[PDB]
Design a protein around this ligand. Structure first.
Ligand SMILES: [K+]
Ligand SMILES: [K+]
Ligand SMILES: [Mg+2]
Ligand SMILES: [Mg+2]
Ligand SMILES: [Mg+2]
Ligand SMILES: [Mg+2]
Ligand SMILES: [Mg+2]
Ligand SMILES: [Mg+2]
Ligand SMILES: [Mg+2]
Ligand SMILES: [Mg+2]
Ligand SMILES: [Mg+2]
Ligand SMILES: [Mg+2]
Ligand SMILES: [Mg+2]
Ligand SMILES: [Mg+2]
Ligand SMILES: [Mg+2]
Ligand code: NA
Ligand code: NA
Lengths: 50, 122, 197, 116, 203
RNA sequence: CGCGGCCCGAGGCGGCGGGGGCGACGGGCGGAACUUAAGCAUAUCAGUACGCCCCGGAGGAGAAACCAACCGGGAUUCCCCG
RNA sequence: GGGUGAAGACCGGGAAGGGGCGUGCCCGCCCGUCGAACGGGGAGCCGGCGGAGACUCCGGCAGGCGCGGCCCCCGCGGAGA
C-alpha cells in the first residue's frame, strides 16, 4: 500500500537490495561451478510475507 | 602503511583528539571522491589505510582513558562494575575457600587432639 | 458547621487496632488473663522505679568507653580490679525464672503488655508457690529503660545496700498490701455493654 | 478538619546519590558531524539544482533530523543554510535537500568540496 | 525452665485461657492478607526448636491456606475415559496443608531460602502457619559455621523439590525397614532399578 | 490540649540479591487412551506418554523409634543371586 | 493493594492510591501518551517547471500557532433589542 509503517518499509528495503546476481569477478576468483544465486525472487511469483 | 600505535601512545589527549578530527575530515573527503567521478587507484588505496588509522587512534584514546579511570578507583570499597574481576555469574555467587572450611569450636577442639599420623603395617 | 473528625475513614491498620481494643473490653476474659489488665497503682510504681534506678546496670556510653579502655588495660595486667562488683538488677525471663526457683529474688516486676502473653502467663502462680513477692507494672518500655534495653519482660531485685533497706521494706509492705492472689484468681473480666457505658 | 478524607502524609524525598559511577568513561555515538554526512549525489538533475535553486543533495545517516543536519553542514562547510527537506528512499537511505542562504553562491561551495 | 513452662502450657490447647487467646488471634488474622511479614515469631520456643535465631538474616512470614478436599479441573465436571477415573469432587490432596504453605511462600519470595514451619491457628475455614526464611547473602549468615550450609547452590528452592520436613513426610521418608523398601532413594528410582533389563557380555 | 518511650504501620535513599536459556541424566506434582483379557465394566497397558515447577556437575539418599530369632548382625548408595 | 487455583494462570473498588505555587502553605476518594490513514480535529490558493515527484519544488499571494525586542490602556454609546 501507500500508507505503511517505517518498520515494514525497512524490511522490504533489504529484500530489494539482496536480489542480485553473483558478480563476474567473484565467480572466477572462487572457481565457482554453479553461477546462479537461488535466493533471488520475482515479484510476479513470490510471497514475501513482510 | 598507516600510523603505528607505538608512537601514538606518546601523545597527549588533546593532540590525539585533533588527530582524530583531521582523520575523520579527510575520510569524508575520500568518501566524496569515491561517490563522484571515479575510483583512481591512489585514493582508493588511501581509503582503507585511513579507515584503519581512525580505528587505531580511537583504540589508543580509550586505553588511556580506561587506565586513568582505573587508577582513580584503586582502593575504594565500591568500584564501577566495569573494573571488577572477570568471573562467571555462578562463581561470582559462591562461598570463598575459608568460609567452606569453617567449623564450630567444639569440632575444632576435637580435630586438634587427634591429628593424622603416618604409620605402616608389618 | 460541625466537626468532621468522627466520620473519617481511617486506614485498615488503625481500624484493626481500635476494634481489637473494643473486643478485649467487652468479652468474657478468664481470670488468669484478667490479672494482667489490673496493674499496680502509679505512686508505688514511681517509688519502685526510683529505687530501681539507683541500681541500674552499666550505661551504653560507659560501655563504649570500657570497650576500649578496660579492653586494652586487661592486657597490661591487674585484671581482677577491672570488673567491679557493683550491685545490679537482673533482667530476662530465663534468668528470672532460674533465681525465683532458688529463692534468691526478693521482688519481681512483670510487664502488663507482653505479646504473646503465654511468655509470662504462669509466672505469678510460680512466684506465689515459691513465696516471692511480685508486682505487675505498666510497660515494657519502662522496664527496658531501667536496664538500658529497648524493652524487657521483667526485672528482679537480688540484693540491696544497707542504706536503702528501709525504703525497700516500705515498698515491700505496700506491695504485699496491694497485690492479692486468691481474689485475682477468682475474678473474671470484660463483659461491658456498649450502651451501658 | 474541613475534609472528611484521610490522605497519605507528606514526607521528605531524597535525590539519587550513587556510591560508584554507572558510566565512568564518557563514550561517543554516531552523531559526530563528519560521520553524520556520508556523500553528495551526482546527477544532471542535481547539477541543475545547484545552478538553478542554490541547493545541494546529500546522503546522511537515517537517525539524523533536520536541525542537526543543518548544524553539521554549517560546521563542516563554512557557510549558511536556509532550509532543509528530507526523504527516506526505497532502499533505506536518508536524502537531504540543502538550500543555501541567498547571499551564498552554492556553486562555489560545491566546486570547492569537489562536487562540481 | 521458662521454655519448659511454655511447652507444658502449649500442650493444653482447650483451657479457658488458651481458648480466649486463640479466639483473639484468629479474629486478628482474619482481617489481614494471605501472606504477611512478621516482626518476630509468635511462638519463640517452637521457633527455637526448629532452628530460628535472633540475628540479622532470619525472617518470619505468616501464611494462610483453605481447608477441605480438592475438586478436579475438568470442564463441566466430565471425565471421559474408563469408569474407574470418573470422580470429580471427592478427592484428597497428596500433600498436607503444612507443605502447601511453604510452596506458596517460596513462590512469592524466590530470593530467600526456606527452613521450617509450624502451626499457629485454625478457624474452620483456614489454617495459619509460620515459615522461617534465611537471607543467603547477608554477611552474618555467610560467616557463621552453624548456618553456612544453606548458602550452597544445592539449597535453591528446597520446597520445590520436596526436601523440607513436610515434603519428606509426604514422600514417605519418615519410615524405615519393612514397609519402606520401595521408596528410597525415591519411588521412580526404585521402580527404574527393579525393571531394568541387564544384558551382560557373558550372559 | 501539646511531647517523650515502647508497639504496629507508611514514603524515600544506599549497598547487595532474584527473574530468562539448556531433544540427556536428577527431584517434586498433575495425569491418559490405544492395547491384552480372543466380547467387556474390576484388572492390564502404567504409578508410562504428555503438561507444569526446580537444581547440579551430578542429583537424590544417609549415621536406626533397622533387620532378625542366629554359637546373630549393624548409616546410605551401586553390582551379582532368587 | 489484592483473591483463587498443585501449577501454568485466571478473576478484581474499598486500598495511607496526586498536584500546585515555590518551600511554606494550600487543594485533592479511586487507572491507561491502549483501541478509528472513513467518526472529532487550528490553519492553503493560483501560475509555472521535469523523464520518472508535487495541496510537498520555484514564483506570487495568504492562514495558523509560538518566542524575543520597542511603544504600550484597569470602558464608553443606546429608549431598548
Ligand atoms: K499403575
Ligand atoms: K486516526
Ligand atoms: Mg562509536
Ligand atoms: Mg538431605
Ligand atoms: Mg530500592
Ligand atoms: Mg501399544
Ligand atoms: Mg479386548
Ligand atoms: Mg482381537
Ligand atoms: Mg472391542
Ligand atoms: Mg503395576
Ligand atoms: Mg545431597
Ligand atoms: Mg490511541
Ligand atoms: Mg477525520
Ligand atoms: Mg508555502
Ligand atoms: Mg505521478
Ligand atoms: Na525460574
Ligand atoms: Na552450571
Amino acid at each position: 500500500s501507500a500508507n505503511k509503517t517505517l518498520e515494514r518499509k525497512l524490511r522490504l528495503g533489504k529484500k530489494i537490495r539482496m536480489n542480485k546476481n553473483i558478480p563476474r569477478w567473484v565467480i572466477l576468483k572462487d572457481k565457482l561451478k554453479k553461477r546462479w544465486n537461488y535466493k533471488r525472487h520475482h515479484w510476479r511469483r513470490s510471497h514475501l510475507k513482510l | 602503511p598507516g600510523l603505528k600505535a607505538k608512537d601514538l601512545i606518546g601523545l597527549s589527549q588533546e593532540d590525539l583528539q585533533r588527530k582524530l578530527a583531521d582523520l575523520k575530515r579527510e575520510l569524508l573527503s575520500l568518501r566524496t571522491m569515491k561517490a563522484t567521478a571515479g575510483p583512481v587507484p591512489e585514493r582508493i588505496a588511501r581509503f582503507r589505510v585511513c579507515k584503519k588509522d581512525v580505528a587505531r587512534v580511537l583504540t589508543i584514546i580509550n586505553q588511556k582513558a580506561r587506565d586513568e579511570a582505573r587508577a582513580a578507583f584503586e582502593g575504594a570499597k565500591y568500584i564501577p562494575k566495569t573494573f571488577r574481576p572477570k568471573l562467571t555469574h555462578a562463581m561470582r555467587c559462591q562461598l570463598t575457600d575459608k568460609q567452606k572450611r569453617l567449623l564450630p569450636n567444639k569440632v575444632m577442639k576435637r580435630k586438634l587432639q587427634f591429628p593424622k599420623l603416618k604409620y605402616a603395617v608389618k | 458547621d460541625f466537626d468532621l473528625t468522627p466520620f473519617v475513614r481511617w486506614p485498615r491498620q488503625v481500624r484493626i487496632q481500635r476494634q481489637k481494643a473494643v473486643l478485649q473490653r467487652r468479652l468474657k476474659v478468664p481470670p488468669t488473663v484478667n490479672q494482667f489488665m489490673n496493674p499496680i497503682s502509679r505512686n508505688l510504681t514511681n517509688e519502685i522505679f526510683n529505687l530501681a534506678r539507683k541500681y541500674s546496670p552499666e550505661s551504653k556510653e560507659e560501655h563504649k568507653a570500657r570497650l576500649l579502655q578496660i579492653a586494652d588495660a586487661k592486657a597490661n595486667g591487674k585484671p581482677l580490679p577491672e570488673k567491679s562488683d557493683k550491685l545490679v538488677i537482673a533482667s530476662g525471663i530465663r534468668r528470672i525464672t532460674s533465681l525465683v526457683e532458688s529463692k534468691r529474688a526478693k521482688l519481681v516486676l512483670i510487664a502488663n503488655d507482653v505479646d504473646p502473653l503465654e511468655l509470662v502467663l504462669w509466672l505469678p502462680t510460680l512466684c506465689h508457690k515459691m513465696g516471692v513477692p511480685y508486682a505487675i507494672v505498666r510497660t515494657k518500655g519502662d522496664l527496658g529503660k531501667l536496664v538500658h534495653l529497648k524493652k524487657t519482660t521483667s526485672v528482679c531485685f537480688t540484693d540491696v545496700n544497707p542504706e536503702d533497706k528501709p525504703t525497700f521494706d516500705k515498698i515491700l509492705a505496700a506491695v504485699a498490701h496491694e497485690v492479692d492472689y486468691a481474689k485475682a484468681m477468682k475474678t473474671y473480666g470484660g463483659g461491658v455493654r456498649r450502651e451501658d457505658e | 478538619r474541613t475534609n472528611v478524607h484521610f490522605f497519605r502524609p507528606k514526607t521528605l524525598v531524597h535525590k539519587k546519590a550513587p556510591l560508584y559511577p554507572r558510566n565512568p568513561i564518557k563514550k561517543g555515538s554516531w552523531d559526530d558531524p563528519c560521520d553524520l554526512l556520508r556523500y553528495p549525489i551526482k546527477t544532471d538533475e542535481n547539477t541543475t539544482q545547484i545552478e538553478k535553486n542554490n541547493t545541494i543533495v546529500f546522503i546522511v545517516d537515517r537517525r539524523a533530523s533536520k536541525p542537526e543536519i543543518r548544524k553539521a553542514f554549517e560546521t563542516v562547510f563554512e557557510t549558511k543554510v536556509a532550509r532543509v527537506n528530507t526523504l527516506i528512499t526505497p532502499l533505506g537511505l536518508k536524502k537531504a535537500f540543502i538550500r543555501l542562504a541567498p547571499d551564498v553562491q552554492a556553486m562555489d561551495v560545491a566546486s570547492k568540496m569537489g562536487l562540481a | 525452665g521458662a521454655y519448659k513452662y511454655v511447652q507444658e502450657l502449649w500442650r493444653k490447647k482447650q483451657s479457658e485461657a488458651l481458648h480466649y487467646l486463640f479466639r483473639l488471634r484468629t479474629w486478628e488474622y482474619r482481617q489481614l492478607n494471605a501472606i504477611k511479614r512478621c516482626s518476630h515469631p509468635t511462638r519463640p520456643e517452637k521457633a527455637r526448636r526448629l532452628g530460628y535465631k535472633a540475628k540479622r538474616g532470619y525472617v518470619v512470614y505468616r501464611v494462610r491456606v483453605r481447608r477441605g478436599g480438592r475438586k478436579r479441573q475438568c470442564v463441566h465436571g466430565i471425565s471421559y475415559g474408563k469408569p474407574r477415573n470418573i470422580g470429580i469432587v471427592g478427592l484428597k490432596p497428596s500433600r498436607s496443608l503444612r507443605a502447601l504453605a511453604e510452596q506458596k511462600v517460596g513462590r512469592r519470595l524466590p530470593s530467600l531460602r526456606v527452613l521450617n514451619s509450624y502451626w499457629v491457628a485454625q478457624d474452620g475455614s483456614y489454617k495459619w502457619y509460620e515459615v522461617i526464611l534465611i537471607d543467603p547473602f547477608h554477611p552474618w549468615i555467610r560467616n557463621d559455621p552453624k548456618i553456612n550450609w544453606i548458602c550452597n547452590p544445592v539449597m535453591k528452592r528446597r520446597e520445590c523439590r520436596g526436601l523440607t520436613s513436610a515434603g519428606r513426610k509426604a514422600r514417605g521418608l519418615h519410615n524405615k525397614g519393612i514397609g519402606a523398601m520401595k521408596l528410597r532413594p525415591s519411588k521412580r528410582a526404585a521402580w527404574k532399578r527393579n525393571h531394568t533389563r541387564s544384558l551382560r557380555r557373558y550372559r
